[PDB]
Amino acid sequence: KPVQNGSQLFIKELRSRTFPSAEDVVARVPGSQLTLGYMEEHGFTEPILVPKKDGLGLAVPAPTFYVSDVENYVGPERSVDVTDVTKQKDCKMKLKEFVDYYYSTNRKRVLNVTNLEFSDTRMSSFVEPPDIVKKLSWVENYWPDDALLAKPKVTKYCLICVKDSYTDFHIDSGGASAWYHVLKGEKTFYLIRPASANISLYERWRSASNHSEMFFADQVDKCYKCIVKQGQTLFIPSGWIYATLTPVDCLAFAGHFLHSLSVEMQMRAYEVERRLKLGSLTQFPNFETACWYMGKHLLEAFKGSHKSGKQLPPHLVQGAKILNGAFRSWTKKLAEHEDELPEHFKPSQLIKDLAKEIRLSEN
Ligand SMILES: O=C(O)CNC(=O)C(=O)O
């Protein structure tokens, strides 16, 4: 039976299939313990489920917030990306038209909105990302408020998924990490660890002509099933390959971020991404610019290291090496990389300044 990913038959079969529980890799942590200390101690290599919002500093509206309200705050005439799940093709319509669809009592289509970034709408002020995200995020920490280049617009997403909707396996753009909060309903995540062969398998799969006919989880040793219920929050680490299935109508909020715990994986994903040459819809805008700002901050931290005699932790120094490599790669090359370079940056001087500083540290 040659079925397509996201088809009614596929979903039907996917619902009945058995998966190792995410009990094996996903840590349950109360909102208050999810601190910079916790993250630094553990290294954010595994998904984290926070069952209850308390202590997260997450701000969301009450579950009494319906799809019709989203239409009201966002704007019924706003253009929105809509995935037809069963075709696995994307299209664009008015929010009001999707809403009309959502409230139909005989939907003949399976349609989701998963790309709706609402930072530029009246709905923005109803949602604030978890404090830990603000703490880890490169953009939040290191992208100046007065920058000439617009911040990456990936901070506040509203997701509206109907029953039996499916998003196929993917790595988030930029190897970015993610938080997902389920406001109403539930969402099932299928989580695959970014072990080196898994990433390599994922690239070959995603680049195969007939990937939409192949269930990726069939190719890996372990694909963990994680149900995220109403009121719960999931944090997905850099590089994890995941898909989702929505067992009932679901409303969720989400955001993407880069952080210093996963410099290596972030660059890896980015490289996979630039090879696949796909997407251009869910892409992490100005990933490279965020890296440039981080390079600057690093050079500024290495230097402060001389006034402190307090060397930099190994993972930052190794981050420096990775970013410097990427910097060298993007420059003297080539003609589109320049478009992501922040004002008043001297690419050549930063690179040499960082190489020396890394040199000094190792010595
Ligand atoms: O639909 C999905 O599960 C994938 N979601 C996204 O990448 C996002 O916008 O956070």
Side-chain angles (χ1 to χ4, degrees), residues 2 4-7 10-11 13-40 42-91 93-105 107 109-279 283-306 309 311-317 319-331 335-351 353-355 357-363:
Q4 183 193 49
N5 292 10
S7 77
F10 164 83
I11 274 73
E13 279 168 34
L14 176 56
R15 280 180 174 261
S16 67
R17 176 91 78 83
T18 311
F19 295 86
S21 170
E23 282 275 304
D24 302 336
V25 300
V26 176
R28 288 178 193 247
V29 172
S32 53
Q33 311 310 280
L34 201 47
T35 87
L36 222 26
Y38 182 97
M39 295 300 241
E40 298 170 349
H42 287 76
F44 196 16
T45 67
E46 292 188 339
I48 292 163
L49 171 61
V50 187
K52 297 199 303 209
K53 130 172 68 156
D54 316 84
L56 281 171
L58 173 74
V60 291
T64 41
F65 198 76
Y66 308 139
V67 164
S68 59
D69 293 291
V70 171
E71 188 184 52
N72 284 346
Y73 290 98
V74 169
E77 293 290 330
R78 170 162 185 163
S79 185
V80 296
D81 290 323
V82 172
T83 303
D84 176 325
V85 172
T86 65
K87 295 184 72 180
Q88 289 300 301
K89 183 58 176 183
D90 298 329
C91 69
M93 71 180 60
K94 292 289 185 42
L95 184 62
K96 76 182 181 191
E97 181 187 340
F98 179 81
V99 166
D100 205 27
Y101 159 88
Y102 180 79
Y103 282 109
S104 58
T105 197
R107 303 158 173 172
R109 283 163 303 167
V110 175
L111 313 179
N112 288 13
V113 158
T114 62
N115 189 49
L116 170 46
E117 220 278 355
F118 66 89
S119 65
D120 49 332
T121 73
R122 308 163 205 96
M123 200 170 96
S124 177
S125 54
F126 282 99
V127 169
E128 302 295 334
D131 286 328
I132 185 67
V133 170
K134 290 184 172 177
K135 283 182 170 61
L136 282 174
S137 165
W138 279 358
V139 170
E140 181 83 26
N141 290 324
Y142 307 137
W143 197 293
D145 289 312
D146 65 333
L148 306 185
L149 296 175
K151 287 183 170 172
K153 197 175 178 299
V154 299
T155 69
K156 292 180 193 190
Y157 288 104
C158 182
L159 289 72
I160 312 161
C161 307
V162 303
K163 190 248 296 183
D164 300 327
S165 79
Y166 173 86
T167 300
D168 204 358
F169 295 97
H170 69 283
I171 301 195
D172 287 332
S173 174
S177 289
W179 61 274
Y180 279 95
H181 179 84
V182 174
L183 199 73
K184 178 183 166 195
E186 62 194 276
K187 271 214 163 62
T188 299
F189 285 77
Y190 300 92
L191 301 163
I192 294 173
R193 171 183 313 277
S196 182
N198 286 349
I199 305 174
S200 295
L201 292 178
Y202 162 78
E203 185 177 345
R204 305 183 57 111
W205 166 74
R206 192 61 200 80
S207 71
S209 59
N210 31 50
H211 79 97
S212 287
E213 302 170 2
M214 261 177 298
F215 191 50
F216 177 70
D218 284 345
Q219 295 184 35
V220 304
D221 183 28
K222 292 289 178 175
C223 174
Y224 302 95
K225 177 184 174 198
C226 186
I227 306 132
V228 184
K229 307 236 180 177
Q230 183 165 304
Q232 305 194 318
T233 308
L234 181 63
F235 299 78
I236 301 175
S238 178
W240 282 70
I241 295 156
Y242 70 100
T244 68
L245 172 74
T246 308
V248 301
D249 287 6
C250 182
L251 180 54
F253 305 115
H256 296 298
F257 60 106
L258 310 183
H259 60 81
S260 311
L261 292 184
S262 297
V263 180
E264 172 174 20
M265 184 65 65
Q266 271 160 189
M267 298 301 308
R268 178 70 179 295
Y270 190 64
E271 298 169 348
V272 171
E273 221 177 323
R274 291 277 274 180
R275 286 191 293 264
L276 291 169
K277 300 155 182 178
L278 59 67
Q283 300 301 30
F284 197 102
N286 287 268
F287 173 90
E288 296 178 23
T289 312
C291 292
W292 285 109
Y293 281 127
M294 174 66 182
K296 186 161 190 271
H297 159 261
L298 285 176
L299 176 67
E300 296 172 338
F302 269 120
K303 289 197 168 178
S305 305
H306 304 144
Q311 196 157 350
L312 286 193
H315 79 273
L316 295 190
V317 179
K321 284 198 296 181
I322 286 136
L323 286 171
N324 222 16
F327 295 158
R328 307 176 184 278
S329 189
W330 301 336
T331 53
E336 156 59 31
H337 291 308
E338 197 147 336
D339 208 34
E340 294 207 32
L341 192 68
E343 64 273 10
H344 303 131
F345 262 61
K346 296 291 287 185
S348 307
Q349 189 63 357
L350 179 63
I351 292 152
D353 281 349
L354 279 147
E357 299 285 359
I358 290 155
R359 201 226 330 180
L360 183 143
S361 170
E362 314 164 0
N363 301 8

